[PDB]
RNA sequence: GAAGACAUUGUCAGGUGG
RNA sequence: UUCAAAUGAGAACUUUGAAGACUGAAGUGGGGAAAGGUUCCACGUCAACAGCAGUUGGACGUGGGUUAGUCGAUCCUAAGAGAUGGGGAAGCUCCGUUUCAAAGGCCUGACAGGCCACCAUCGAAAGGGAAUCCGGUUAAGAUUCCGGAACCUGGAUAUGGAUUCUUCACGGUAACGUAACUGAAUGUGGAGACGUCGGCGCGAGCCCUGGGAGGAGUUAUCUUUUCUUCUUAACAGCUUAUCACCCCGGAAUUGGUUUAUCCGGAGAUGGGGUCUUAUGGCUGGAAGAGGCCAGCACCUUUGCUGGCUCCGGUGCGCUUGUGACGGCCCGUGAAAAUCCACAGGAAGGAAUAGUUUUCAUGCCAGGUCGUACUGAUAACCGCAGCAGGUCUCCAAGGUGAACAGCCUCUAGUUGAUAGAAUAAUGUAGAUAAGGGAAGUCGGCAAAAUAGAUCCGUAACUUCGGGAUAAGGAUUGGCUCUAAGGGUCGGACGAUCAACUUAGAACUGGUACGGACAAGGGGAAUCUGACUGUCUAAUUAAAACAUAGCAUUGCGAUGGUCAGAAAGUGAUGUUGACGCAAUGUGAUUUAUGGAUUAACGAGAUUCCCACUGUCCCUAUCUA
RNA sequence: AUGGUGAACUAUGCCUGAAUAGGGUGAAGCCAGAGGAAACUCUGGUGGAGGCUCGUAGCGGUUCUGACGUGCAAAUCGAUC
């Protein structure tokens, strides 16, 4: 589109730094199961909806 | 841009208060069959519009550079 | 009805109209987007201020533009010209006629068409008239009627011969065709 | 930045969004104690903003940029 | 032949978004972004067009001076130097007219 | 280069080598305007001579719109018999 | 020349929508697209248009019509018939 | 201006009646 | 698709380099809209994904990156939706959009007098609209940044200039002009503001190319040769044009003029002149920049210096813009915001000094948001990286009618799992003697002529067509002839340049629209009048609409039609040449009768040639 | 039956914008000539209209009952019209 509304560009700064994978160092915590980050995202595969 | 023909209208605008800086520039043109001439180009900051005057003679530009005031900033080409 | 340019209306039934008479004018004389006649842009000036009042008349045949009408209730008898329908005798053909005084017009304003007044009531006053149809219906004469025919007759006269005139026809009034 | 830095007296910063240019030279002349010439912002895509600052001839960068601790 | 890019983003033919070709110092044809023609000013009474003026857009007409959107006679920015003829030798000869139908209406009112 | 010199000496034009109309290939119209627009001018640039009067132009303005005017060489040869037809008409 | 013996003006249509349709039409044909006669300028240089109207280039007047004619029968017949009627009823 | 104790509006009872 | 090198452990596949091909400019190119949203760029990296493999990648991790007074949105209003008033509705909320409203603000001028008239607001990133160009620059963006150069609006305020003691300039017959040359309330007018098609002119860009100067390449042999470069914006100053307009004077022996035939005593032709300034030209802008070359330095931060950067021509050429005309319609092909002017003249102001900030100079400021990327036989939608679909601009050369098809340059891919083998049969594509539709329900399919010119083309008809009718001939190359023109001089001549046609020879496979591209035709019968529309996803007609014909109803408290009810609502901004429902569908002569030219992916019979449909099957190619 | 949601595919009316070679035939009106006492009429050109016509892109899906149908495709492919 490129004509884009602020707001979208906002929900996109959310996807953007939402898909990143787990920091590592919370892999040894104490009684941890997160260990793979499951709401993770890419672009062709689901959409957003917006 | 613009261009003048007066010298005389062209001596005051070098005099005005907005002019901080000018130049010549010198060209390298042949007339109709004529002989290879060089040409001055005294152009100067004016600020809402460049003011420039062209001139062939050599012995009026070395008349008018020593014309002009000392305190004006002057660049070549 | 995104270029009908305005409705072919008549003038109110103001202190002018109703005790003497006015001089208006025309300015041109305009196509009506999807209209069977023509219409006039027609011009007075304004009695009680100071500008030019913007009329729609209806164009009645003979009437060029640069003309004049003096008009109201003491309007000479002329065409183009309006009276309510006392004044004048039998006979007087008028056009874009109104059903009730100051409705600006119901009656006899398609083209080509007219009406025909044949008789009097002058006491109790009204005016006898004829509609195209020919039914006769008697009315109150302070109503009005333009002088002459509505310009334009022998409109139906010339067949279309092919489906996309039609279909330009009837594009523009109503998305009535094409019919089952 | 360093290549907008050594090519036009220029600087950037990294903004709050809701401020504007008027903002940014105001605040920069303010705490930095230099002129300015013009301000140029976009919004970076992250949801930031990013402002480039041009200074005056009167001015340097690279002094500044060492009084402020970042090079 | 070199191949042409609209500059603006509006990727259509339209009234508005027009090109002229204009060749270029350096040496690589672009597209020039043509704006819209003027139109004469005209005659309110004539409906024709009028001499001595500038067409020009609309707001642009506020840069130029009184001159050039001007003409020195009395209706000067909108006439046509024919109509204002026609309508002032109407205005003087039925101003005289008024005066006939003054002696005509003193002559019957005498009578009475 | 080479091709298009042969054509211009008048070669690969037979009827083997043509695949389009004669219309397509030289119009009717482009080829009456070209030689009615000469005429016209050869007619004017004669009237302001004076070498033909005002209503012998007029008359051949409407004869040269029409045929019987084939070509330029045609049309002057007419224009020296109609010289000589003027002289027979007032000596005679 | 004459370049037919009967279909006349109405030949682009071709062989089309009938022959006792193509003369009627073709008589309607003829009357519209002509030029007539100005009553101020007395010329052959009135066109219509936009089907009511009646235009003289020629002194720029404009008259409202018939929609294929300047003018009716009934409209002569109005206007004689007013002839009479304004001098019988103003005196 | 038209119309005026009728119209009408609120509620009831006949004929007809996919 | 092929060969070598690098990488790495490992290469049918990555990268580079040498060849071969292709899309062949209505593209496998470069940009955009909607949508997508970090896919864009680098570095690192392969356990997954890329239906093979993978050292590669739109995949994975880490980061970088989107710069605006001028492009756009915002502003305008469009068909249209939608508040408040008010009224209904048990009620959620509804009808309505200026109307059963105390709707809002000023203008002097001593709390009193006076004027004005609306009605909200929302809705177009393709309509209207204030104003910007070039060059350079990055790993990635630029009308945004940098360097340079202009413009618009809104402010303040000094100067210059002009006008003035005749206060609101002068000139010119007039067209109108110049550097400006006051002016409110109110009024009027103009722009914005407007169709489709045709032909004609003009110019822009591109194409063809002459000469000159530079660089590259072929040169066994020929070619004063083949290819590329030689450019110049915004904006400002000066200048220039058709239509039209002004002065002179008065036309018949009627004249002027377009391609196209219209104009004139309502004043032509002609002489002279005014304006519009799209476009065109000169200069600045601007050579300093860009480009094309050479010579120098040097791991060099990477640089330095020289030159040249010129002058022409033609065209129905291609595309596009504009102009003056014409046709075109029962179709006549929008309104508003905004800007300007004009009439109007409240009033203000100089002489010892003012007035003019619509002339020139001069000063400060121009905010919010979008801006990367792809736009598709991998970046979107189709459950997917699917032989599908999605609006639009640029559009070269040969060819030829061409924007068909074939080939090529600019640019970009070389992607589609590969290798070795040729058994059938398949699928697509072809050829076959002799006969020539016998085969078969059925000329289903295949095949035949197809292009351009000369002659010629019947009956029948609604006279308009049928008609590319039928049918016969001709079609190559090389060298000639004739005709078809402009510009310059007073019967003609000198110079300048184009492809159009015709005509006569000579020649060879006696083949020549040689490829590619490209109608088979005709004799009878019936139906619907026709162009047209559809049962997508079993039916594309003898079904549907169509213009016409005739009938019937309605005169506004009306007809049709609708609502929860209303102070409701469409038709209706309408009014009997109208509004609405009917049977029926062109023509001759109303479950409708006899007839009918053209036309139909309508249905049937037959004639020509044509041919593997068949006797009778055989071979070849991916 | 009650209460809600849907016109991004598709049907229909609007509004505003945009797009569509190269060809064939040759309508009015006009020009010239000829005929005719006239009215009018024949020829040669002009002009470039026509819900005419061929043909591309574009739209559509007639047919082959073809490729393909455990398809690239939950309707494609090519050829045909
Ligand atoms: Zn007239």
């Known amino acids: 589109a490129a004509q884009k509304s602020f707001r979208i560009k906002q929900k996109m700064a959310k996807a953007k730094k939402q898909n990143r994978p787990l920091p590592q160092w919370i892999r040894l915590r104490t009684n941890n199961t997160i260990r793979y980050n499951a709401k993770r995202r890419n672009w062709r595969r689901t959409k957003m909806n917006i | 841009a613009r261009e003048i023909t007066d010298i005389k209208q062209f001596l005051e605008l070098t005099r005005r208060a907005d002019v901080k800086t000018a130049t010549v520039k010198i060209n390298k043109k042949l007339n109709k069959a004529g002989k290879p001439f060089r040409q001055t180009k005294f152009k100067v900051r004016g600020s809402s519009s460049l003011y420039t005057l062209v001139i062939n003679d050599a012995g009026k530009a070395k008349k008018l550079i020593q014309s002009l005031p000392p305190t004006l900033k002057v660049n070549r080409l | 009805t995104r270029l009908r340019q305005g409705a072919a209306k008549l003038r109110t039934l103001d202190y002018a109209e109703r005790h003497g008479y006015i001089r208006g004018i025309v300015k041109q004389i305009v196509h009506d987007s999807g209209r069977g006649a023509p219409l006039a842009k027609v011009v007075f000036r304004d009695p009680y201020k100071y500008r030019l009042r913007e009329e729609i008349f209806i164009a009645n045949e003979g009437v060029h533009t640069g003309q004049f009408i003096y008009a109201g209730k003491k309007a000479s008898l002329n065409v183009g010209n309006v009276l309510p329908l006392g004044s004048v005798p039998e006979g007087t053909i008028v056009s874009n006629v109104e059903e009730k005084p100051g409705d600006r017009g119901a009656l006899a304003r398609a083209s080509g068409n007219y009406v025909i007044i044949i008789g009097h009531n002058p006491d109790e006053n009204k005016t006898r008239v004829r509609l195209p149809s020919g039914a006769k219906k008697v009315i109150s004469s302070d109503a009005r009627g333009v002088i002459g025919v509505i310009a334009g007759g022998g409109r139906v006269d010339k067949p279309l011969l092919k489906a996309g005139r039609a279909f330009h026809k009837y594009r523009l009034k109503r998305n009535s065709w094409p019919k089952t | 930045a360093m290549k907008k830095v050594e090519d036009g007296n220029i600087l950037v910063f990294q903004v709050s969004m809701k401020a504007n240019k008027y903002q940014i030279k105001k605040a920069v002349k303010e705490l930095y104690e230099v002129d300015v010439l013009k301000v140029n912002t976009l919004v970076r895509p992250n949801g930031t903003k990013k402002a480039y600052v041009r200074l005056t001839a009167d001015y340097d960068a690279l002094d500044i940029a060492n009084r402020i601790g970042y090079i | 032949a070199q191949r042409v890019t609209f500059r603006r983003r509006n990727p259509y033919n339209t009234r508005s978004n027009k090109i002229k070709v204009v060749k270029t110092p350096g040496g690589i044809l672009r597209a020039q972004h043509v704006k819209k023609l003027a139109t004469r000013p005209k005659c309110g009474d004539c409906g024709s067009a009028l001499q001595g003026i500038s067409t020009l857009r609309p707001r642009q007409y506020a840069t130029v001076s009184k001159t050039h959107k001007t003409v020195s006679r009395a209706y000067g920015g909108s006439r046509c130097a024919n109509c204002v003829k026609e309508r002032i030798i109407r205005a003087f000869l039925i101003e005289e007219q008024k005066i006939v139908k003054k002696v005509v209406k003193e002559q019957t009112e005498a009578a009475k | 280069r080479a091709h298009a010199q042969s054509k211009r000496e008048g070669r690969h034009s037979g009827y083997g080598k043509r695949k389009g109309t004669r219309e397509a290939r030289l119009p009717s119209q482009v080829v009456w305007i070209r030689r009615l627009r000469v005429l016209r001018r050869l007619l004017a640039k004669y009237r302001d001579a004076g070498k033909i009067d005002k209503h012998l132009y007029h008359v051949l303005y409407k004869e040269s719109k029409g045929n019987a005017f084939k070509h330029k060489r045609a049309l002057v040869e007419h224009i020296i018999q109609a010289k000589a037809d003027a002289q027979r008409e007032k000596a005679l | ?91």
């Open chain 7, 1 to 91: 020349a004459k370049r037919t013996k009967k279909v006349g003006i109405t030949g682009k249509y071709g062989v089309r929508y009938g022959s006792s349709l193509r003369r009627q039409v073709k008589k309607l044909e003829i009357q519209q697209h002509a030029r007539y006669d100005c009553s101020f300028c007395g010329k052959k240089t009135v066109k219509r248009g936009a089907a009511g109207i009646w235009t003289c280039s020629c002194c720029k007047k404009t008259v409202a019509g018939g929609a294929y004619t300047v003018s009716t029968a009934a409209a002569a017949t109005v206007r004689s018939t007013i002839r009479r009627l304004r001098e019988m009823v103003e005196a």
